[PDB]
Amino acid sequence: MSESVAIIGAGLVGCLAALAFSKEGYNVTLYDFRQDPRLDTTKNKNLKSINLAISARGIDALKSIDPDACEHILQDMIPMKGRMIHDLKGRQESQLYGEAINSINRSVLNNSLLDELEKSTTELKFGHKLVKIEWTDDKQICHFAIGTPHTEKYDFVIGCDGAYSATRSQMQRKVEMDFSQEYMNLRYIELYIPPTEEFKPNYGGNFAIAPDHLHIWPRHKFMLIALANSDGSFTSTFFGSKDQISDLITSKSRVREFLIENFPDIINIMDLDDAVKRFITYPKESLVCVNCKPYDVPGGKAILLGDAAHAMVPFYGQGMNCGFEDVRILMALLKKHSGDRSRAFTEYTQTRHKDLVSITELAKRNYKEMSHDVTSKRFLLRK
Ligand SMILES: Cc1cc2nc3c(=O)[nH]c(=O)nc-3n(C[C@H](O)[C@H](O)[C@H](O)COP(=O)(O)OP(=O)(O)OC[C@H]3O[C@@H](n4cnc5c(N)ncnc54)[C@H](O)[C@@H]3O)c2cc1C
């Protein structure tokens, strides 16, 4: 009397979809080939950044799915009431916020959603790697690579397996899918701003700089940002071109001089010798942009959410927020159609694709104003 569902991917989007589906009564199994991140045996926690910005909407999405833990999950998240722009003279300026934004720890949020799933019907399959799907007109046979095979069968499948979605590949045999993938020159380095030693009254904690703002040091074709953490430290990220970075990392002192010159107001609060070490032992990461049409196999057999459907630019686009919104849109559609996945999924591709071609235009307009169009003397160096 209940339909069963396979969810491929236990990242932020995958879990949230598992929650929203248990909550509706479906029989959720959730797979990931990586190990349970909650076990410290796992070295690789698949953590792209230490923390993220979760918008009003992403909170609203997570709310409608798990109204309960939406507050024993979003506890320590820090609300940032605007941006703080840092010019080259270290001068810093508050620009208040249409939609608000909060700093939340990624590994924590990913782990909290996992826990919430144990308090529900959902079975969790870690160490399982989806490798093939056969498409019948009733139940879909999924094959896995543990450890060496295994299979299983399901009324329908959800691909939540990120940017190189195996589920997307399998779907591409069954459907004519417009597909595009682009690799950007954009690279990112993770830096760190330690907590001050003493409690700072004006900031409500051990924060070197204002924790209720998203700190941006906008330069020409590159950028430094910072977001507060609960302990007083800031997760900091450097974004620039692959070519800029690779010309820099050849000379240990070069990187150093680059930093001091472009971000003078961060030497006091950051450990510079280690900042250089971070830049050079920086792990190459492909950044891919992907698009998909449609998001689903006809007759409600399968669907794509998260990066699997639409991997966008870090920072300028908001992946996680969008994946969360995906789930909310999907469920609301399943209700309007009373459980008809075939008529729901179909409308999902219709309306989501409208949304997400406009969304990947506000991530270019955002690339434009903040990063490409930087020429003024306050944000650009003259030797
Ligand atoms: C540096 C950086 C900062 C970012 N900051 C923000 C931000 O502030 N706000 C925001 O909204 N977005 C941000 N994003 C984008 C955001 O991180 C992603 O869009 C989001 O994590 C997508 O999650 P996902 O669950 O869809 O996919 P993923 O995080 O990629 O998770 C998919 C899971 O599927 C698993 N998997 C893959 N293949 C298989 C297989 N076939 N079988 C089983 N499992 C499989 C993977 O192991 C993975 O755990 C940022 C991205 C980066 C790189």
XYZ file of C-alpha atoms and ligand atoms in Angstrom:
436
model
C 0.000 0.000 0.000
C 3.112 2.191 0.206
C 5.415 2.966 -2.724
C 9.190 2.536 -2.242
C 11.954 5.004 -3.193
C 15.735 4.824 -3.694
C 17.664 8.008 -3.001
C 21.175 8.136 -4.500
C 23.266 10.603 -2.492
C 23.528 11.593 1.164
C 24.773 15.127 0.774
C 22.680 18.052 1.921
C 20.084 17.654 -0.774
C 19.824 13.886 -0.569
C 19.152 13.782 3.157
C 16.568 16.535 2.962
C 14.721 14.646 0.225
C 14.939 11.474 2.378
C 13.332 13.430 5.251
C 10.572 14.872 3.047
C 9.760 11.421 1.661
C 9.679 9.497 4.976
C 7.482 12.298 6.321
C 5.017 11.691 3.455
C 4.890 7.938 4.075
C 7.183 6.577 1.321
C 9.615 3.720 1.921
C 12.999 5.468 1.765
C 16.340 3.727 1.357
C 19.228 6.234 1.166
C 22.527 5.307 -0.512
C 26.007 6.828 -0.681
C 29.310 5.214 -1.651
C 31.245 7.345 0.790
C 31.332 6.127 4.406
C 29.154 7.542 7.211
C 30.741 10.934 7.938
C 29.667 10.727 11.600
C 32.336 8.052 12.170
C 35.819 9.531 12.664
C 37.217 6.430 10.921
C 36.167 8.191 7.713
C 39.056 10.523 6.794
C 37.316 12.103 3.789
C 34.077 13.755 4.915
C 33.383 15.118 1.385
C 33.393 18.691 2.741
C 33.630 21.313 -0.030
C 33.703 24.214 2.487
C 33.786 24.448 6.281
C 30.534 26.359 6.375
C 27.913 27.982 4.133
C 25.421 30.752 3.786
C 21.844 29.459 4.219
C 19.207 31.920 3.015
C 15.716 32.689 4.273
C 14.304 30.401 1.606
C 16.591 27.444 2.389
C 15.537 27.752 6.039
C 11.899 27.944 4.963
C 12.426 24.845 2.847
C 14.069 22.896 5.635
C 11.325 24.137 7.938
C 8.383 22.744 5.954
C 10.063 19.324 5.878
C 11.400 19.040 9.416
C 9.525 21.696 11.440
C 10.839 20.011 14.598
C 14.620 19.877 14.406
C 14.581 22.989 12.197
C 15.445 24.504 15.554
C 17.602 21.734 17.020
C 19.678 21.944 13.801
C 19.681 25.687 13.100
C 20.633 26.434 16.714
C 24.152 27.875 16.440
C 23.666 29.270 12.896
C 24.749 32.937 12.824
C 22.566 35.553 11.089
C 24.498 38.036 8.955
C 22.548 41.252 8.447
C 24.506 42.396 5.400
C 27.851 42.519 3.648
C 30.932 44.330 4.911
C 33.072 45.467 2.011
C 36.806 45.851 2.650
C 38.662 48.172 0.260
C 42.423 48.275 -0.391
C 42.986 50.873 2.370
C 41.343 48.327 4.666
C 38.402 50.694 4.917
C 35.230 48.766 5.638
C 31.644 49.485 4.826
C 28.289 48.025 5.787
C 25.712 47.318 3.090
C 22.521 46.032 4.671
C 20.134 43.547 3.084
C 15.612 41.688 -0.087
C 16.590 38.359 1.535
C 18.643 37.581 4.725
C 21.484 35.049 5.249
C 22.948 32.807 8.025
C 26.313 31.115 8.601
C 25.980 27.431 9.438
C 28.588 24.718 9.717
C 28.435 22.299 6.772
C 29.616 19.093 8.442
C 27.267 19.850 11.368
C 24.184 20.449 9.175
C 24.906 17.372 7.019
C 25.263 15.342 10.287
C 22.139 16.779 11.948
C 19.970 15.805 8.970
C 21.384 12.294 9.098
C 20.449 11.918 12.775
C 16.905 13.188 12.146
C 16.619 10.375 9.600
C 17.399 7.690 12.199
C 14.386 8.967 14.161
C 12.368 7.842 11.117
C 11.549 4.848 8.944
C 14.442 5.440 6.476
C 17.121 2.736 6.114
C 20.603 4.131 5.482
C 22.910 2.328 3.066
C 26.493 3.662 3.217
C 29.377 2.130 1.257
C 26.945 1.474 -1.621
C 27.840 2.919 -5.026
C 25.108 3.119 -7.688
C 26.529 1.737 -10.957
C 23.525 0.840 -13.113
C 19.770 1.217 -13.322
C 17.425 -0.867 -15.451
C 14.155 0.842 -16.341
C 11.005 -1.264 -16.292
C 7.471 0.165 -16.389
C 6.884 -0.893 -12.786
C 9.956 -1.140 -10.586
C 13.526 -0.009 -11.237
C 16.423 -2.398 -10.608
C 19.412 -0.571 -9.122
C 22.859 -2.143 -8.922
C 25.554 -1.398 -6.344
C 29.299 -1.723 -5.775
C 30.014 -2.223 -2.077
C 33.387 -2.890 -0.451
C 31.685 -7.159 -5.276
C 28.050 -6.605 -6.462
C 24.380 -6.474 -5.270
C 20.968 -5.188 -6.493
C 17.480 -4.042 -5.412
C 14.118 -2.811 -6.782
C 12.058 0.396 -6.347
C 8.884 2.128 -7.541
C 10.978 5.174 -8.425
C 14.454 6.686 -7.970
C 15.821 10.097 -6.884
C 19.252 11.212 -8.130
C 20.863 13.419 -5.491
C 24.404 12.350 -6.214
C 26.027 15.661 -7.034
C 27.677 17.115 -10.114
C 28.882 13.882 -11.755
C 25.542 12.162 -11.129
C 25.637 8.497 -12.037
C 21.836 8.550 -11.762
C 21.861 11.252 -14.438
C 23.863 8.996 -16.739
C 21.504 6.054 -16.321
C 18.566 8.358 -16.984
C 20.237 9.499 -20.200
C 19.761 6.061 -21.808
C 16.051 6.052 -21.019
C 15.492 9.683 -22.032
C 16.694 12.246 -24.576
C 18.251 14.664 -22.137
C 19.706 18.013 -23.156
C 22.869 18.098 -21.164
C 25.701 20.559 -20.768
C 28.784 20.614 -18.606
C 31.287 23.471 -18.348
C 34.517 23.698 -16.321
C 35.319 27.138 -14.985
C 38.757 28.633 -14.461
C 37.495 29.494 -10.992
C 39.398 27.975 -8.101
C 38.975 28.346 -4.360
C 41.313 28.222 -1.384
C 40.117 27.717 2.213
C 41.716 30.058 4.724
C 41.144 30.543 8.457
C 40.712 33.455 10.827
C 41.294 32.239 14.428
C 39.184 33.506 17.325
C 40.528 36.427 19.328
C 41.826 35.478 22.770
C 39.350 37.579 24.815
C 35.544 37.863 24.583
C 34.754 41.011 22.550
C 31.717 42.802 24.070
C 30.755 44.543 20.785
C 30.580 41.264 18.835
C 29.140 38.884 21.401
C 32.127 36.572 21.229
C 35.730 35.912 20.333
C 35.459 37.508 16.891
C 38.359 39.416 15.257
C 35.824 41.320 13.122
C 32.033 41.843 12.963
C 30.392 38.373 12.993
C 26.970 39.604 11.896
C 28.253 40.538 8.404
C 29.460 38.627 5.358
C 32.958 39.937 4.771
C 34.016 40.537 1.210
C 37.325 41.884 -0.072
C 36.388 42.473 -3.708
C 39.296 42.821 -6.167
C 39.688 42.635 -9.947
C 38.961 39.061 -11.064
C 39.464 37.733 -7.521
C 37.953 37.796 -4.081
C 38.337 36.995 -0.437
C 35.343 36.317 1.811
C 34.744 35.440 5.498
C 31.880 33.932 7.534
C 31.720 33.557 11.286
C 31.703 30.291 13.179
C 30.313 29.595 16.647
C 33.658 29.541 18.434
C 34.661 33.024 17.250
C 36.739 32.046 14.222
C 35.874 32.806 10.582
C 35.827 30.383 7.679
C 37.565 32.311 4.936
C 37.695 31.546 1.221
C 39.850 32.811 -1.608
C 38.317 32.736 -5.135
C 40.204 33.497 -8.345
C 41.213 32.074 -11.703
C 43.166 28.812 -12.058
C 45.853 30.756 -13.921
C 46.229 33.530 -11.369
C 46.660 30.994 -8.602
C 49.112 28.768 -10.451
C 51.368 31.714 -11.310
C 51.287 32.671 -7.620
C 51.994 29.290 -6.029
C 55.380 28.983 -7.741
C 57.014 31.368 -5.317
C 56.399 31.061 -1.585
C 57.170 34.776 -1.155
C 55.102 35.736 -4.173
C 51.892 34.439 -2.556
C 52.837 36.307 0.641
C 53.388 39.605 -1.177
C 50.152 39.136 -3.166
C 48.237 38.699 0.129
C 49.778 41.652 2.024
C 49.229 43.917 -0.968
C 45.600 42.978 -1.742
C 44.322 42.159 1.721
C 46.363 44.349 4.079
C 43.706 44.401 6.819
C 43.868 40.616 7.282
C 47.522 40.133 8.291
C 46.775 41.057 11.917
C 43.966 38.507 12.254
C 45.284 35.716 10.050
C 48.423 33.590 10.283
C 50.239 34.544 7.106
C 52.911 31.829 6.947
C 50.148 29.259 7.186
C 47.965 31.168 4.734
C 50.805 30.735 2.221
C 51.008 27.049 3.101
C 47.262 26.724 2.459
C 47.551 28.389 -0.972
C 50.324 26.049 -2.170
C 49.258 22.688 -0.703
C 45.939 23.708 -2.233
C 44.107 20.703 -3.646
C 43.121 21.154 -7.268
C 39.359 20.935 -7.575
C 37.476 20.918 -10.866
C 34.577 23.295 -10.680
C 31.848 22.132 -13.079
C 28.623 23.828 -14.219
C 25.894 21.451 -15.381
C 22.446 21.675 -16.939
C 19.763 19.101 -17.643
C 16.458 18.839 -19.412
C 14.418 17.065 -18.414
C 14.978 16.383 -14.712
C 12.860 13.223 -14.807
C 12.062 9.933 -16.524
C 8.421 9.861 -17.792
C 5.727 8.118 -15.720
C 7.327 9.150 -12.423
C 10.220 6.681 -12.632
C 13.069 9.006 -11.628
C 14.110 12.563 -10.840
C 17.129 14.828 -10.270
C 17.699 17.335 -7.485
C 20.684 19.265 -6.176
C 23.937 19.407 -8.097
C 22.832 16.344 -10.025
C 20.239 18.534 -11.775
C 22.030 21.916 -11.766
C 25.597 22.305 -10.473
C 26.278 26.044 -10.326
C 29.097 28.471 -9.484
C 30.132 28.589 -5.849
C 29.317 31.915 -4.083
C 27.821 33.676 -7.131
C 25.246 30.906 -7.339
C 23.768 29.201 -4.274
C 23.744 25.448 -4.817
C 22.604 24.169 -1.446
C 19.844 26.738 -1.073
C 18.566 25.785 -4.536
C 18.709 22.056 -3.837
C 16.701 22.629 -0.669
C 14.164 24.682 -2.630
C 14.026 21.816 -5.196
C 12.704 19.483 -2.500
C 10.096 21.954 -1.265
C 8.862 22.569 -4.826
C 8.680 18.861 -5.569
C 6.637 17.875 -2.503
C 4.202 20.762 -2.858
C 3.673 19.460 -6.388
C 3.154 15.890 -5.243
C 0.394 17.141 -2.941
C -1.382 19.300 -5.550
C -1.504 16.078 -7.654
C -2.427 13.820 -4.725
C 0.498 11.421 -5.123
C 0.617 11.246 -8.884
C 4.389 11.204 -9.419
C 4.005 11.097 -13.174
C 1.936 14.292 -13.385
C 4.003 15.900 -10.595
C 7.546 15.167 -11.899
C 6.390 16.322 -15.314
C 5.240 19.659 -13.952
C 8.468 19.761 -11.930
C 10.690 19.887 -15.041
C 8.263 22.411 -16.572
C 8.346 24.971 -13.780
C 11.752 24.294 -12.227
C 13.498 24.745 -15.528
C 11.848 28.151 -15.904
C 13.110 29.072 -12.466
C 16.599 27.705 -12.959
C 17.425 29.408 -16.227
C 16.630 32.723 -14.581
C 18.556 31.647 -11.443
C 21.662 30.933 -13.479
C 21.386 34.494 -14.765
C 21.480 36.104 -11.333
C 24.747 34.191 -10.771
C 26.244 35.959 -13.766
C 24.773 39.300 -12.785
C 26.329 38.550 -9.430
C 29.634 37.567 -11.049
C 29.344 40.874 -12.951
C 28.783 43.499 -10.244
C 31.059 41.964 -7.570
C 33.981 40.452 -9.491
C 34.169 41.345 -13.219
C 33.219 45.057 -13.001
C 35.891 46.101 -10.492
C 37.976 49.037 -11.754
C 37.657 51.807 -9.130
C 40.818 52.982 -7.291
C 39.444 51.776 -3.926
C 39.264 48.094 -4.997
C 42.011 47.927 -7.648
C 45.772 48.269 -7.351
C 47.993 50.726 -9.099
C 51.618 49.655 -8.444
C 33.443 26.127 -1.747
C 31.957 26.040 -1.934
C 31.133 26.859 -1.161
C 29.741 26.790 -1.317
N 28.933 27.599 -0.535
C 27.574 27.552 -0.685
C 26.769 28.376 0.090
O 27.258 29.159 0.891
N 25.399 28.330 -0.057
C 24.836 27.464 -0.963
O 23.612 27.448 -1.059
N 25.624 26.637 -1.733
C 26.994 26.674 -1.608
N 27.796 25.851 -2.382
C 27.165 24.886 -3.343
C 26.777 23.647 -2.520
O 27.885 23.170 -1.792
C 26.258 22.456 -3.324
O 25.322 22.854 -4.319
C 25.589 21.409 -2.412
O 26.438 20.815 -1.436
C 24.973 20.336 -3.302
O 24.746 19.211 -2.499
P 24.115 17.879 -3.138
O 23.526 17.111 -1.974
O 23.119 18.221 -4.234
O 25.352 17.124 -3.822
P 26.705 16.647 -3.102
O 27.132 17.542 -1.979
O 27.743 16.501 -4.190
O 26.320 15.246 -2.446
C 25.970 14.180 -3.308
C 26.361 12.861 -2.651
O 26.179 11.790 -3.540
C 27.200 10.848 -3.348
N 27.304 10.077 -4.592
C 27.798 10.490 -5.804
N 27.669 9.478 -6.685
C 27.103 8.418 -6.050
C 26.747 7.134 -6.468
N 26.518 6.896 -7.764
N 26.167 6.281 -5.554
C 25.935 6.672 -4.256
N 26.284 7.937 -3.861
C 26.858 8.793 -4.740
C 28.415 11.672 -3.031
O 29.338 10.948 -2.250
C 27.824 12.840 -2.264
O 27.899 12.666 -0.867
C 29.177 25.907 -2.252
C 30.005 25.080 -3.025
C 31.393 25.150 -2.873
C 32.285 24.268 -3.697
